[PDB]
Amino acid sequence: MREIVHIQAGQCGNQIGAKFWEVISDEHGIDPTGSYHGDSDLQLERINVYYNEATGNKYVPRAILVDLEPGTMDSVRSGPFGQIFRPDNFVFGQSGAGNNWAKGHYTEGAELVDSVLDVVRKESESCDCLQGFQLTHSLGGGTGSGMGTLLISKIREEYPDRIMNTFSVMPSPKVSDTVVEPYNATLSVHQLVENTDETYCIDNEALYDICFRTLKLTTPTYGDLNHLVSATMSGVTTCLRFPGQLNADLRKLAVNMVPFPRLHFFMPGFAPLQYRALTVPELTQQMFDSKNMMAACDPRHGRYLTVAAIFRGRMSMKEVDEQMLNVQNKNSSYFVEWIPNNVKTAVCDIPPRGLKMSATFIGNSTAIQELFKRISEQFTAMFRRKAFLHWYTGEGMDEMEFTEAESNMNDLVSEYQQYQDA
């Protein structure tokens, strides 16, 4: 029945994951205790996609919470919708990962990974027809980055024929915890290139700029940043969670969006970012605007391979179709000519909370290379002096593995530039 298994790893992965569940539980009418109290059967028609039906007509998220320290997951359990999560699905260590990819991937995380897989297996076994997996994590830390990609590697071994997608938060010096973030990110990107079908690249620099420049927040917190991520994740999963014209699972959606296996790193977008409702032209304009992009990449610096757009709310579908056909025919130079009709649009009647109507952007642009270039610059800047490497070699890693990760991402960059000049 097209069930999705959700996994969240690390500090960022769990805090963002929790907000996601907090938002969609509200949309489906599920209270923190797991009881349904909505007002429409449309909220329950595809409730099985992310929720398991309990004994007493309760709905428990198909989510698995992973960390190497209990700090963040204790905060989740003490949160608003904390009691909604299945207790056994809380898998945690005590040591922590210390913002170290090696600790998450090779030492500390390796000691815990089988425990997570047992929970994954337990959730998967009770699925009528498993649709795929979904991971929320950061790439700049240790747990979500190192253990997260290790989990993905394991899942692909046990479930080679299942879709593996991630919502990955990209590190940025503007919003940074440690200096080793480019090290952890480069190591993780190599894993994602090979072992995921779709990765939504969420840039913290972009999130910061949106909160500061647009949302007019002088001192943006992680909470403010996760508000944008939560709203985007809701929009991306809207067509999967609600009835509509679109009858597609993760695989079919992946087929129409990914023309080349390695090039599957998407730029998320959202509109609006107020009492005055937006018009369809305004939604479409903002949706394609760089200021609504969350990968911190300028789409004009590249070309769109494929584009997906999801509209929510009661609106003129003719006007939507006209406006989408307006942007494409006014900026046809930014869409590849060797992929006919690469821009697809879906509408959903049920709007998110607080907005009468909204729009979510999913772009497979070659401009995403700017993100990897940026990470690669920061990486090389330290690695040429072998700086901070002792943290990693102390966990058993060799310099060669760093050189290889560096080379694979430069290859990824070169691959993107290959189709930008096509």
């Binding site: 695989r251 079919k252 129409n256 990914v258 494929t306 579908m317 000519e337 006919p340 697809k344």
Partner: protein, 437 residues
Amino acid sequence: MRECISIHVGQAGVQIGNACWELYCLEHGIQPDGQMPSDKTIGGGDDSFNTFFSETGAGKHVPRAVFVDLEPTVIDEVRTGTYRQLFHPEQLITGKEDAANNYARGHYTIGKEIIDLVLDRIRKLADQCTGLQGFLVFHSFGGGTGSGFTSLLMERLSVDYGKKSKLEFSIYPAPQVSTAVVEPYNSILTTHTTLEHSDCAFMVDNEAIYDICRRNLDIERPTYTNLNRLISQIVSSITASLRFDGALNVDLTEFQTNLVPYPRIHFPLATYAPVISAEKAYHEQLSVAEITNACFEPANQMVKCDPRHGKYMACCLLYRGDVVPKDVNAAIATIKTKRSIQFVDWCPTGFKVGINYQPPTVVPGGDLAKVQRAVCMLSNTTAIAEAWARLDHKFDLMYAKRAFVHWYVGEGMEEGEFSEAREDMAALEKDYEEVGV
């Protein structure tokens, strides 16, 4: 009497299947529970409608149809729909997960696991046939199931039923009502494998049905329900000869005989008139001449093309309603002196005309108004090759960069089947050009 078994593959095939069988029941006066007060031969008899309907001892009239899809969400609507008592559970076949718009998935990966089951259920209907004509296959070009599993089925049907004819009702992919991008691949792939297995295929471009619904029915954003109810009308016009008393196209063989002189060129263009809005209060009823003249207007064709810049190999006129032969011929003589209708030198410049006195039936509450007379033209024009041209061009654009190809190779298909299929289409366009210009 000789029976005809319909097979509906994929979402497009199943939903259009629903539209047609609904329309068939309304035409033959069959109630949703299966009963038919008109039929006096209880539990048997070999009337014209028995070609499509079987009869039980209880008096139920059951469609000789099989519904197959690789995911249940669409067919489940038939299991709990208005005509749920009409079908037997064995006639409705569903799988776990679909082909995800991947031809290779529907043909090789998933199709292999369910092909024997489908054939066995078809065999169940075939055993209740005293003299089976053949099969009518409904499917889309763009879908993984509609393209992939259909071609596999068509291959096996030629093996298990070699003496039986096979007709196609195919949905040509249109971007305005599709969210898929790899449809040009699936279209070309399934045409290449099905070509030597289909005797006659009626292509229906969603782009054409879309605009007809917009222009003539005043519908802003036509839905699948809108498209299918219109498609069902055209299909009904084509299969009416098989379901009613007559002398034109009485069996599936005559479709090939009267429309397909060259085997590979078995894609007749269909034109229909009139399409009138049900929300239109005052409407001047069109004449025989007016609806006949409309058959040569491109805006009424199931595929948008220009027959003026091609050649005809065959042409049939199927009238339904208040139509007399005198007015028909009076219109035909007039049309030739105003229209550019060129035939090939090795074919007679003529028309096979058929009249069904029973007026067109429309679904109560639908968007289509009731008309006193309607006509469907089936013409084999080389102009329909324009659709192949468009399709193959999109193929060339993507395949030059090998875009999306890895999805197909990952399902066990070799890259060589792409170029092998494309070369077949290159030859197909060449055939049309030789016959045409």
